[PDB]
Design a protein around this ligand. Structure first.
Ligand SMILES: *[C@@H]1O[C@H](CO)[C@@H](O[C@@H]2O[C@H](CO)[C@@H](O[C@@H]3O[C@H](CO[C@H]4O[C@H](CO)[C@@H](O)[C@H](O)[C@@H]4O)[C@@H](O)[C@H](O[C@H]4O[C@H](CO)[C@@H](O)[C@H](O)[C@@H]4O)[C@@H]3O)[C@H](O)[C@H]2NC(C)=O)[C@H](O)[C@H]1NC(C)=O
Ligand SMILES: *[C@@H]1O[C@H](CO[C@@H]2O[C@@H](C)[C@@H](O)[C@@H](O)[C@@H]2O)[C@@H](O[C@@H]2O[C@H](CO)[C@@H](O[C@@H]3O[C@H](CO)[C@@H](O)[C@H](O)[C@@H]3O)[C@H](O)[C@H]2NC(C)=O)[C@H](O)[C@H]1NC(C)=O
Ligand SMILES: *[C@@H]1O[C@H](CO[C@@H]2O[C@@H](C)[C@@H](O)[C@@H](O)[C@@H]2O)[C@@H](O[C@@H]2O[C@H](CO)[C@@H](O[C@@H]3O[C@H](CO)[C@@H](O)[C@H](O)[C@@H]3O)[C@H](O)[C@H]2NC(C)=O)[C@H](O)[C@H]1NC(C)=O
Ligand SMILES: *[C@@H]1O[C@H](CO[C@@H]2O[C@@H](C)[C@@H](O)[C@@H](O)[C@@H]2O)[C@@H](O[C@@H]2O[C@H](CO)[C@@H](O[C@@H]3O[C@H](CO)[C@@H](O)[C@H](O)[C@@H]3O)[C@H](O)[C@H]2NC(C)=O)[C@H](O)[C@H]1NC(C)=O
Ligand SMILES: *[C@@H]1O[C@H](CO)[C@@H](O[C@@H]2O[C@H](CO)[C@@H](O[C@@H]3O[C@H](CO)[C@@H](O)[C@H](O)[C@@H]3O)[C@H](O)[C@H]2NC(C)=O)[C@H](O)[C@H]1NC(C)=O
Ligand SMILES: *[C@@H]1O[C@H](CO)[C@@H](O[C@@H]2O[C@H](CO)[C@@H](O[C@@H]3O[C@H](CO)[C@@H](O)[C@H](O)[C@@H]3O)[C@H](O)[C@H]2NC(C)=O)[C@H](O)[C@H]1NC(C)=O
Ligand SMILES: *[C@@H]1O[C@H](CO)[C@@H](O[C@@H]2O[C@H](CO)[C@@H](O[C@@H]3O[C@H](CO)[C@@H](O)[C@H](O)[C@@H]3O)[C@H](O)[C@H]2NC(C)=O)[C@H](O)[C@H]1NC(C)=O
Ligand SMILES: *[C@@H]1O[C@H](CO)[C@@H](O[C@@H]2O[C@H](CO)[C@@H](O[C@@H]3O[C@H](CO)[C@@H](O)[C@H](O)[C@@H]3O)[C@H](O)[C@H]2NC(C)=O)[C@H](O)[C@H]1NC(C)=O
Ligand SMILES: *[C@@H]1O[C@H](CO)[C@@H](O[C@@H]2O[C@H](CO)[C@@H](O[C@@H]3O[C@H](CO)[C@@H](O)[C@H](O)[C@@H]3O)[C@H](O)[C@H]2NC(C)=O)[C@H](O)[C@H]1NC(C)=O
Ligand SMILES: *[C@@H]1O[C@H](CO)[C@@H](O[C@@H]2O[C@H](CO)[C@@H](O[C@@H]3O[C@H](CO)[C@@H](O)[C@H](O)[C@@H]3O)[C@H](O)[C@H]2NC(C)=O)[C@H](O)[C@H]1NC(C)=O
Ligand SMILES: *[C@@H]1O[C@H](CO)[C@@H](O[C@@H]2O[C@H](CO)[C@@H](O)[C@H](O)[C@H]2NC(C)=O)[C@H](O)[C@H]1NC(C)=O
Ligand SMILES: *[C@@H]1O[C@H](CO)[C@@H](O[C@@H]2O[C@H](CO)[C@@H](O)[C@H](O)[C@H]2NC(C)=O)[C@H](O)[C@H]1NC(C)=O
Ligand SMILES: *[C@@H]1O[C@H](CO)[C@@H](O[C@@H]2O[C@H](CO)[C@@H](O)[C@H](O)[C@H]2NC(C)=O)[C@H](O)[C@H]1NC(C)=O
Ligand SMILES: *[C@@H]1O[C@H](CO)[C@@H](O[C@@H]2O[C@H](CO)[C@@H](O)[C@H](O)[C@H]2NC(C)=O)[C@H](O)[C@H]1NC(C)=O
Ligand SMILES: *[C@@H]1O[C@H](CO)[C@@H](O)[C@H](O)[C@H]1NC(C)=O
Ligand SMILES: *[C@@H]1O[C@H](CO)[C@@H](O)[C@H](O)[C@H]1NC(C)=O
Ligand SMILES: *[C@@H]1O[C@H](CO)[C@@H](O)[C@H](O)[C@H]1NC(C)=O
Ligand SMILES: *[C@@H]1O[C@H](CO)[C@@H](O)[C@H](O)[C@H]1NC(C)=O
Lengths: 155, 360, 155, 155, 46
């Protein structure tokens, strides 16, 4: 939960500041998956390259409440990621087989979620995750579609 | 051949526990005489104790080692005394004393073998009492309470680092302030190392006689809490004494101080007798272990080496202090190159199609 | 984080001592992945066979700092493992598609890393992890090679 | 470790009470994996749809011992699940390739394990996990069987 | 923060954010594995 990252290409400040320009377009409308991939690429690289916890800083911590709460969020996220179904071609982040409707989730709710809001006009994550869970079963998505099977079976 | 980087999450390797680690749990099997944590069970694999191993590892911060060798903390006997005031003209106090193996302070060879002291990095906490409590309660029960001494004792000051301890150390002494030039200023230890080893069934007697009343200091039923302060600053380790105290029996004493007259001058005698010893067991739990043997620490290369050490989990009175103890833990994941006879593949999908074509 | 393992084939002591003989050759030069597999086999089995936390010992813990730091390291290790790309034929440990160079990482650095050192002559894990991350993308490795496709398409 | 779930289809009380009727048959004999799937379906959905830790309740916690013990059990469970070999068609829970014997594990041991017992007449999970680990290697199960290869090459 | 700081500015404490959900557009339908993609490559090389 505490790391000293000297030998990395980019730090947290550079990752945050460099991505903010592309984050303007992300807040305005739906972007392509390649646009989203390029936007989070350096952040994902940074959070996959830490070596070990800095013991000099870690052994001085007195109140453990904030650390334990942060670790509980990380554990919950990892548990949910293990259950997700993702497209094979993207590995940095997970693309689910759930189709975006835009009649149930207007873009204003998505924009409010990206800004870090939790009012009643924001995207409801718990409701969305239930929908994704009961539509991403391995017995509904692992087997390719009928058209795909017939498409390649020409020869 | 094709060599690739591989990650091994659970290698069968170990690394040394250092003074920059936070304290670990050491379990004793007797809660009557020693504070917790308590576990009376035997180790889960009693037939695996003492398996031999050769070790050659490095470290970043000084490793925690116990024994008589460079870089290891020396063990020695510590005494804790309970003083009960007595309303009598013949007997002034009654004593209950506990002797056990503890950490050895460095000796001021300039003076009459006093302890080397330090005043750096004084911690917050309740100070040690300078006066005897007037309300004794449950003399049969020993109460351990953390206490901050007036000065820290130095356990190590050399090229392996500086280790200091702010827990009190108790001895018998004379005040000597406002007295004539015949008041001796030497500190006296009531029990020595042979009192825990040489005999156990035999009765032990200690007699201290002088022309001046005997004072106990520094007061406080408190256990060592050593910490490194040089070249790095780490947390206190109040569990290391639990390992040394199980290496010998603990001796329980009782006695008194009485006043008489010799040569028409007041005479004070301290009598202590013991017929009781208690055997203890101290253990660590996985992923922690103990390395016992001829452990060599080389600070120039930061290397720990031993030939024919044994891997242990528990310390008891059969322990021999010609060996040293090194605290180790199972190591985290490691990276290593390994070679394959064919190129890297993600799935056996192409492999599966090979047996389909050959099956036809 | 604390377990009592009575009914296991090997304890921690036997795992460590029995593998130390093969660990001598592991510190000297590059071994085959079958050699590496046999060396870590019993350690992996032991750390996958614990049942539950020993509640008698866990409820006595007073200072939680060392436990939380240990759990943070295990959580961080699991997050990185979830992102790694591994060869299909080995499941005990992960073989990445990153080729060992030996002109960038001499064996002395690897040997120092195997001993638990962190000086400036040791292998730099953060730098290595960044190289492995930007070379193990699913769009570069999941699809078999050009020669492999033509190798089996003969019949 | 502490969540407030208002916008979910079912709460913890409803999940526990509604599944108890089917749990009677689960305690008496071996059921089909479809029966097991329908029994745990709503519990898995609930534990995959929490959004974030309730900060109002989390910041008030004084004694962290119980929370850290709970997180350690969760972390150990996730680590073990990462190495499990599972059938492709079921993703809510993991079906291993280890065959139930019933000459080594009588149903009475399984029923006692399902009730939450740990006596010496209960199923030994540490012993069972070691057998499953040593029989679920990728080089024994990933490649389909000999009859399966010959059973499809007819055309 | 050091003594060169100018108190005509304000300081806000921030942290790196947790995971987020975002709609995302692809040029082809969602796929679980490249198995069909592999079979197409085999048939095109024959
Ligand atoms: C915490 O853990 C420690 C370390 O294990 C335990 O310490 C042991 O305590 C027991 C019981 O107090 C000690 O056993 C005693 O040893 C003496 C005789 O044993 C010696 O001689 C026999 C004869 O050959 C040998 O087999 C043996 O190995 C020893 O060399 C006696 O003091 C005691 O004898 C008592 O029992 C026998 C019956 O067997 C009677 O005949 C005697 O009259 C008498 O009743 C006793 O056997 C043992 O030595 C200690 N182990 C050590 C020092 O390593 C603590 O007890 C434990 N504390 C707890 C659980 O609270
Ligand atoms: C995309 O989303 C729309 C609209 O979703 C609606 O608003 C959201 C914010 C949520 O509250 C949704 O639950 C809500 O439906 C979906 O269209 C909707 O489909 C439902 C189900 O077919 C329609 O309900 C109908 O209502 C009556 C009975 O109450 C009957 O006519 C029908 O039996 C049916 O139940 C609902 O009217 C309809 N809404 C609109 C505005 O068209 C839409 O299905 C979805 N697109 C998908 C899934 O592809
Ligand atoms: C295996 O590694 C070698 C050596 O790696 C070198 O040393 C390491 C410790 C790291 O510091 C590396 O960054 C460092 O390169 C690789 O060979 C090296 O390749 C680079 C890139 O082609 C060469 O740099 C060249 O330098 C000048 C401009 O500065 C120009 O000639 C070129 O444009 C080029 O950038 C470098 O000289 C070269 N080093 C040696 C000793 O030959 C090697 O590529 C790698 N093997 C792989 C990737 O298969
Ligand atoms: C299903 O399980 C049975 C019985 O398992 C037995 O009871 C369990 C509670 C555990 O304690 C098991 O370890 C124990 O075996 C298995 O049948 C058993 O197979 C073993 C191995 O073949 C037999 O041991 C034999 O014993 C002697 C030497 O001691 C020789 O005849 C043989 O060399 C062999 O080792 C054992 O007798 C046998 N038990 C019974 C009751 O038949 C069975 O293999 C297993 N089914 C599987 C794996 O498909
Ligand atoms: C993520 O980090 C990468 C680097 O790891 C950043 O890409 C880098 O972006 C800079 C600025 O655009 C590129 O420099 C360019 O080089 C030439 C110089 O002639 C020219 O095209 C431009 O004037 C510019 O200076 C750099 O090459 C590029 N590095 C790469 C692609 O490896 C990227 O911007 C970061 N993205 C985010 C969203 O944080
Ligand atoms: C899986 O993802 C990879 C990486 O995004 C996809 O490869 C990409 O394919 C697109 C479509 O052909 C390429 O874009 C085009 O490339 C050239 C550039 O000169 C040109 O034809 C067009 O201007 C356009 O940009 C893209 O370069 C390529 N990216 C990489 C890194 O190779 C791949 O198609 C995906 N596989 C699927 C969806 O099955
Ligand atoms: C990992 O654990 C396994 C056991 O689970 C160890 O393998 C075992 O090794 C012993 C010692 O070599 C083998 O015993 C041998 O048996 C015969 C005679 O009975 C003979 O070949 C030898 O004299 C020896 O006694 C035992 O069969 C073997 N068990 C197996 C393979 O199931 C292994 O050594 C451990 N490895 C490490 C690196 O810790
Ligand atoms: C995936 O890994 C498995 C397990 O390591 C590989 O199976 C192994 O294949 C090698 C090469 O044939 C076998 O070694 C040879 O076996 C016999 C022993 O009498 C003999 O021909 C040679 O002396 C040599 O040792 C090895 O026994 C075998 N291991 C097992 C457990 O079956 C398999 O090849 C790998 N699959 C790939 C790379 O696609
Ligand atoms: C898990 O939760 C699901 C809902 O998410 C529960 O399934 C629901 O069960 C009820 C009671 O059987 C079903 O109602 C029935 O519907 C029809 C009329 O529409 C008829 O069969 C009955 O008269 C009754 O009203 C309800 O449709 C169904 N919901 C579904 C399938 O979406 C399920 O019982 C829960 N299971 C466990 C084990 O907790
Ligand atoms: C993977 O799992 C799925 C989901 O459980 C399996 O699909 C299920 O297949 C069975 C067997 O055909 C279906 O049962 C039959 O369905 C109809 C009901 O009218 C009828 O033909 C029979 O009475 C029988 O009940 C079941 O409905 C179906 N479930 C779903 C949700 O589609 C699938 O077979 C599995 N794939 C495997 C094992 O390879
Ligand atoms: C640890 O190293 C020592 C010393 O190298 C090993 O002792 C040698 O053991 C071999 C057989 O294994 C004997 O032939 C030699 O005579 C021994 N002494 C030497 C070389 O001086 C020991 O085996 C090693 N391993 C352990 C203790 O597990
Ligand atoms: C020794 O006895 C004296 C009283 O005779 C204790 O009190 C000290 O007295 C001296 C001399 O007047 C003062 O300088 C000190 O300040 C007094 N100390 C306190 C705490 O009041 C003295 O504490 C005794 N010393 C020991 C080591 O017990
Ligand atoms: C102070 O302690 C001494 C030493 O224990 C006591 O002397 C013992 O008295 C008992 C009881 O009569 C005898 O059994 C011992 O033999 C005596 N020991 C020695 C070494 O002489 C003494 O009585 C105590 N004084 C008190 C309580 O005032
Ligand atoms: C020190 O000696 C005293 C006696 O001088 C011991 O106290 C006696 O112990 C015996 C045996 O347990 C009892 O029967 C007596 O009642 C005790 N009191 C007296 C006045 O005799 C004392 O146990 C010894 N101390 C230790 C630690 O063994
Ligand atoms: C959100 O809550 C506020 C509370 O004042 C209410 O006025 C508003 O209409 C709500 N918006 C919704 C439910 O979309
Ligand atoms: C690969 O084979 C070569 C030639 O025999 C050998 O020198 C090299 O060490 C091997 N690489 C390994 C074992 O990683
Ligand atoms: C490592 O640091 C030391 C510091 O004294 C320096 O002397 C040495 O050259 C360094 N080694 C490197 C950078 O390889
Ligand atoms: C379980 O332990 C009890 C202890 O009283 C014993 O009586 C019983 O036989 C044991 N059952 C087993 C080992 O199956």
């Amino acid at each position: 939960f505490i790391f000293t990252l000297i030998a990395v290409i980019m730090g947290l400040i550079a990752v945050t500041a460099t991505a903010a320009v592309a984050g303007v377009a992300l807040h305005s409308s739906v972007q392509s998956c390649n646009f989203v991939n390029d936007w989070q690429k350096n952040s994902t690289r940074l959070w996959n390259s830490q070596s070990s916890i800095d013991q000099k800083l870690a052994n001085q911590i007195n109140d453990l409440r904030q650390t334990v709460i942060w670790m509980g969020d990380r554990l919950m996220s990892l548990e949910h990621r293990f259950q997700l179904q993702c497209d094979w071609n993207t590995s940095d982040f997970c693309i689910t087989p759930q189709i975006y409707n835009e009649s149930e989730h207007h873009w204003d709710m998505v924009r409010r979620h990206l800004q870090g809001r939790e009012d009643n006009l924001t995207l409801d994550i718990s409701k969305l995750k239930e929908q994704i869970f009961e539509a991403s079963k391995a017995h509904l998505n692992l087997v390719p579609g009928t058209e795909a099977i017939a498409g390649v079976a020409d020869g | 051949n094709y060599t690739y980087w591989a990650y091994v999450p659970f290698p069968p390797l170990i690394r040394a526990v250092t003074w920059m680690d936070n304290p670990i749990e050491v379990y004793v099997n007797d809660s009557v005489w020693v504070p917790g944590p308590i576990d009376d069970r035997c180790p889960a694999k009693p037939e695996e104790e003492g398996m031999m191993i050769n070790i050659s590892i490095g470290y970043r911060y000084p490793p925690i080692c116990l024994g008589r060798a460079p870089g290891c903390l020396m063990p020695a006997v510590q005494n804790w005394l309970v003083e009960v005031p007595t309303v009598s003209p013949i007997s002034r106090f009654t004593y209950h004393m506990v002797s056990g193996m503890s950490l050895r302070p460095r000796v001021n060879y300039l003076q009459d073998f006093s302890y080397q002291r330090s005043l750096k990095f004084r911690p917050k906490g309740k100070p040690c009492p300078k006066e005897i409590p007037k309300e004794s309660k449950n003399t049969e029960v020993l109460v351990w309470e953390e206490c901050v001494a007036n000065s820290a004792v130095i356990l190590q000051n050399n090229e392996f680092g500086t280790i200091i301890d702010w827990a009190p150390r108790g001895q018998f002494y004379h005040n000597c302030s406002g007295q004539t030039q015949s008041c001796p200023s030497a500190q006296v230890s009531p029990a020595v190392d042979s009192d825990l080893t040489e005999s156990l069934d035999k009765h032990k007697h200690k007699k201290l006689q002088s022309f001046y009343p005997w004072e106990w200091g520094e007061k406080g039923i408190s256990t060592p809490r050593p910490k490194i302060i040089s070249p790095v600053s780490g947390p206190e380790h109040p569990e290391l004494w639990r390992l040394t105290v199980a290496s010998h029996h603990i001796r329980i004493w009782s006695g008194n101080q009485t006043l008489e007259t010799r040569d028409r001058k007041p005479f004070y005698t301290v009598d202590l007798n013991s017929s009781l010893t208690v055997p203890l067991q101290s253990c660590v739990k996985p992923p922690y272990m103990l390395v016992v043997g001829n452990i060599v620490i080389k600070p120039d290369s930061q290397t720990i080496t031993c030939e024919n050490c044994r891997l242990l989990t528990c310390i008891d009175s059969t322990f021999n202090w010609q060996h040293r103890i090194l605290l180790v833990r199972a190591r985290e994941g490691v990276w290593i190159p390994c070679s394959m006879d064919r190129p890297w593949e993600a799935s056996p999908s192409i492999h599966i199609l090979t047996e389909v074509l050959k099956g036809v």
